[PDB]
Amino acid sequence: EFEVLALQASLRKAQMQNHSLEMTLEQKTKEIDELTRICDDLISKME
Template sequence: MFPEWREVRAVTYLIVLCVVYRKYERSKTVIEGFKKNEEVLRVSLAEYEATIRKQEQKYDVLKSHAMSQLESANQELDSVHRSQQAETAKLKAMLKKAEVKTSSLEEMLEQKVKENQELASICDELINKVGNGE
């Protein structure tokens, strides 16, 4: 071969080597950027997971408190309901007693009216007899 071809080949190899080296350096820079991004994303992921755990704990506490309040309200409602039922039963009994007493008083009134009519009739008869006997 010609000596010029050796030089051309050497220069071509050098150029190719430079191009490959530049690509290597660029690839190395890109990979470093990817690694930095990966680290940033890992940190962000860890922060988000910690935030989610805290929010889940907060949710569980609030849910527990709400369930406790709901249970307490239901117990109070049951207590009020039972109290109202007892009061209603008491009032019904009082009403029944008053109705029986009223009925009894009405019967007594009717009896007294009859007795008064009988007494008035007897008195009228006596007055008539006394008045006729004079």
């Protein structure tokens, strides 16, 4: 009964750690598309 609870705990921790990564990922994707838009507008105007 111990080895299962400790196991269920690990699982909820990994699951928790996963939601974190999927959010961190989404946020990093927005940051990409923004540095894209910024860089392009600057080049676009340097010509």
